[PDB]
Protein backbone atom coordinates (compact mmCIF):
# COMPACT_ATOMS: atom_id res chain seq x y z
CA UNK A 1 0.00 0.00 0.00
CA UNK A 2 0.83 3.66 -0.39
CA UNK A 3 -0.32 7.06 0.73
CA UNK A 4 -0.08 10.73 -0.09
CA UNK A 5 2.99 11.92 1.85
CA UNK A 6 3.66 15.33 3.48
CA UNK A 7 4.91 16.49 0.05
CA UNK A 8 2.82 15.87 -3.13
CA UNK A 9 4.56 12.49 -3.68
CA UNK A 10 3.12 9.03 -3.47
CA UNK A 11 4.94 7.26 -0.62
CA UNK A 12 5.07 3.48 -0.19
CA UNK A 13 4.55 2.47 3.41
CA UNK A 14 6.41 -0.84 3.38
CA UNK A 15 9.18 0.16 0.93
CA UNK A 16 12.04 0.86 3.37
CA UNK A 17 11.30 -2.24 5.46
CA UNK A 18 10.94 -4.33 2.26
CA UNK A 19 14.38 -3.11 1.11
CA UNK A 20 15.88 -4.02 4.48
CA UNK A 21 14.14 -7.44 4.40
CA UNK A 22 15.62 -8.06 0.94
CA UNK A 23 19.11 -6.99 2.10
CA UNK A 24 18.80 -9.42 5.04
CA UNK A 25 17.85 -12.21 2.61
CA UNK A 26 20.97 -11.38 0.55
CA UNK A 27 23.04 -11.53 3.72
CA UNK A 28 21.48 -14.87 4.70
CA UNK A 29 22.44 -16.30 1.28
CA UNK A 30 25.85 -14.60 1.22
CA UNK A 31 25.00 -12.65 -1.95
CA UNK A 32 27.17 -9.57 -2.61
CA UNK A 33 28.54 -9.57 0.94
CA UNK A 34 31.77 -7.64 0.75
CA UNK A 35 33.26 -7.73 4.27
CA UNK A 36 33.92 -10.17 7.10
CA UNK A 37 33.80 -8.77 10.62
CA UNK A 38 35.90 -10.81 13.05
CA UNK A 39 34.99 -10.78 16.77
CA UNK A 40 36.79 -13.11 19.27
CA UNK A 41 37.64 -15.49 16.37
CA UNK A 42 34.01 -15.60 15.09
CA UNK A 43 33.34 -14.33 11.55
CA UNK A 44 30.23 -12.39 10.44
CA UNK A 45 29.66 -11.63 6.75
CA UNK A 46 27.90 -8.38 5.82
CA UNK A 47 27.41 -5.51 3.39
CA UNK A 48 29.65 -2.48 4.03
CA UNK A 49 26.91 -0.01 3.01
CA UNK A 50 24.50 -1.43 5.58
CA UNK A 51 27.17 -1.35 8.32
CA UNK A 52 27.98 2.29 7.46
CA UNK A 53 24.32 3.26 7.35
CA UNK A 54 23.88 2.07 10.98
CA UNK A 55 27.23 2.60 12.76
CA UNK A 56 29.48 5.61 13.31
CA UNK A 57 32.52 3.36 13.62
CA UNK A 58 31.82 1.54 10.37
CA UNK A 59 31.03 4.88 8.72
CA UNK A 60 34.51 6.20 9.67
CA UNK A 61 36.33 3.02 8.64
CA UNK A 62 34.74 2.72 5.21
CA UNK A 63 35.00 6.41 4.29
CA UNK A 64 38.77 6.21 4.96
CA UNK A 65 40.77 6.06 1.70
CA UNK A 66 43.07 3.37 3.12
CA UNK A 67 40.58 1.17 5.01
CA UNK A 68 37.62 1.22 2.56
CA UNK A 69 39.40 -1.52 0.52
CA UNK A 70 39.65 -3.99 3.40
CA UNK A 71 37.55 -7.12 3.06
CA UNK A 72 38.29 -8.17 6.70
CA UNK A 73 37.82 -5.97 9.78
CA UNK A 74 38.87 -7.13 13.28
CA UNK A 75 37.05 -5.59 16.25
CA UNK A 76 38.40 -5.26 19.80
CA UNK A 77 38.74 -8.91 21.06
CA UNK A 78 37.01 -7.90 24.28
CA UNK A 79 33.78 -7.47 22.25
CA UNK A 80 31.16 -10.11 22.94
CA UNK A 81 30.17 -11.84 19.63
CA UNK A 82 26.59 -12.29 20.94
CA UNK A 83 26.47 -8.51 21.51
CA UNK A 84 27.71 -7.94 17.95
CA UNK A 85 25.28 -10.53 16.50
CA UNK A 86 22.33 -8.81 18.21
CA UNK A 87 23.35 -5.41 16.78
CA UNK A 88 24.02 -6.82 13.32
CA UNK A 89 20.53 -8.41 13.34
CA UNK A 90 19.14 -5.06 14.46
CA UNK A 91 20.88 -3.31 11.55
CA UNK A 92 19.20 -5.65 9.06
CA UNK A 93 15.72 -5.87 10.77
CA UNK A 94 14.98 -2.80 12.99
CA UNK A 95 14.38 -5.30 15.85
CA UNK A 96 16.64 -5.19 18.92
CA UNK A 97 16.53 -8.35 21.03
CA UNK A 98 17.33 -6.73 24.38
CA UNK A 99 17.11 -8.66 27.64
CA UNK A 100 18.34 -8.87 31.19
CA UNK A 101 21.17 -11.31 30.44
CA UNK A 102 22.58 -9.43 27.41
CA UNK A 103 21.75 -5.69 27.83
CA UNK A 104 25.14 -4.73 29.32
CA UNK A 105 27.08 -6.54 26.58
CA UNK A 106 24.79 -5.02 23.95
CA UNK A 107 25.15 -1.50 25.36
CA UNK A 108 28.96 -1.80 25.49
CA UNK A 109 29.06 -3.13 21.92
CA UNK A 110 26.72 -0.31 20.71
CA UNK A 111 28.96 2.29 22.39
CA UNK A 112 32.03 0.86 20.60
CA UNK A 113 30.15 0.77 17.25
CA UNK A 114 28.77 4.34 17.81
CA UNK A 115 25.15 3.36 17.52
CA UNK A 116 23.89 6.26 19.61
CA UNK A 117 20.11 5.61 19.42
CA UNK A 118 20.67 2.02 20.58
CA UNK A 119 22.97 3.28 23.42
CA UNK A 120 20.23 5.71 24.58
CA UNK A 121 17.60 2.99 24.44
CA UNK A 122 19.80 0.68 26.52
CA UNK A 123 20.23 3.48 29.12
CA UNK A 124 16.44 3.92 29.45
CA UNK A 125 15.87 0.17 29.94
CA UNK A 126 18.69 -0.10 32.53
CA UNK A 127 17.50 3.07 34.33
CA UNK A 128 13.90 1.74 34.53
CA UNK A 129 15.18 -1.69 35.64
CA UNK A 130 16.81 0.00 38.66
O1 LIG B 1 8.81 -6.57 -8.07
C1 LIG B 1 9.84 -7.07 -7.64
C2 LIG B 1 10.77 -6.45 -6.62
C3 LIG B 1 11.81 -7.51 -6.44
C4 LIG B 1 12.91 -7.54 -5.62
C5 LIG B 1 13.72 -8.67 -5.65
N1 LIG B 1 14.85 -8.76 -4.82
C6 LIG B 1 15.05 -9.76 -3.85
N2 LIG B 1 14.11 -10.71 -3.69
C7 LIG B 1 14.31 -11.66 -2.76
N3 LIG B 1 13.32 -12.65 -2.59
C8 LIG B 1 12.09 -12.67 -3.37
C9 LIG B 1 12.29 -13.21 -4.75
C10 LIG B 1 13.35 -14.03 -5.09
C11 LIG B 1 13.44 -14.48 -6.39
C12 LIG B 1 12.47 -14.09 -7.29
N4 LIG B 1 11.43 -13.29 -7.00
C13 LIG B 1 11.38 -12.88 -5.72
N5 LIG B 1 15.40 -11.74 -1.97
C14 LIG B 1 16.33 -10.79 -2.13
C15 LIG B 1 16.19 -9.78 -3.06
CL1 LIG B 1 17.43 -8.58 -3.23
C16 LIG B 1 13.41 -9.74 -6.48
C17 LIG B 1 12.30 -9.70 -7.29
C18 LIG B 1 11.52 -8.57 -7.25
N6 LIG B 1 10.36 -8.30 -7.97
K1 LIG C 1 35.27 -11.66 24.24
Structure description:
- With about 130 residues, the chain is of the alpha+beta class.
- The chain is built from 6 helices and 5 strands.
- The relative contact order is 0.12.
- The structure holds ligand 7Z6 and potassium ion.
- The site of ligand 7Z6 has 3 residues, from α1.
- It is classed as transcription/inhibitor.
- The entry lists the keywords Transcription Repressor, Transcription-Inhibitor complex.
SSE blueprint:
Layout: E1 2-4, E2 10-12, H1 15-28, E3 35-39, E4 42-46, H2 48-54, H3 56-62, E5 72-74, H4 81-93, H5 103-113, H6 116-129
Parallel strand pairs: 3-5
Antiparallel strand pairs: 1-2, 3-4
The structure holds ligand 7Z6 and potassium ion.
Essential attributes:
6 helices, binds the ligand O=C1Cc2cc(Nc3nc(NCc4cccnc4)ncc3Cl)ccc2N1, 51% helix, monomer, binds potassium ion, 130 residues, Potassium Channel Kv1.1, Chain A, alpha+beta, three-stranded mixed sheet
Distance between the termini: 42 Å
What is the makeup of the main sheet?
Answer: 3 strands, mixed
Tally of individual helices: 6
Strand content bin = 5-15%
CATH arch. level architecture: 2-Layer Sandwich
Strand order of the biggest β-sheet: 4-3-5
- Counting DSSP E segments of at least 2 residues, the number of strands comes to 5
Domain BTB: 33-100
Organism: Homo sapiens
Protein name: B-cell lymphoma 6 protein
Subcellular location: Nucleus
Amino acid sequence: LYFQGADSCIQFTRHASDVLLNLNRLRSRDILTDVVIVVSREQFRAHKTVLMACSGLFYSIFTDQLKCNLSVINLDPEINPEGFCILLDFMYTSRLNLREGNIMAVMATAMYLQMEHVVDTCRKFIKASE
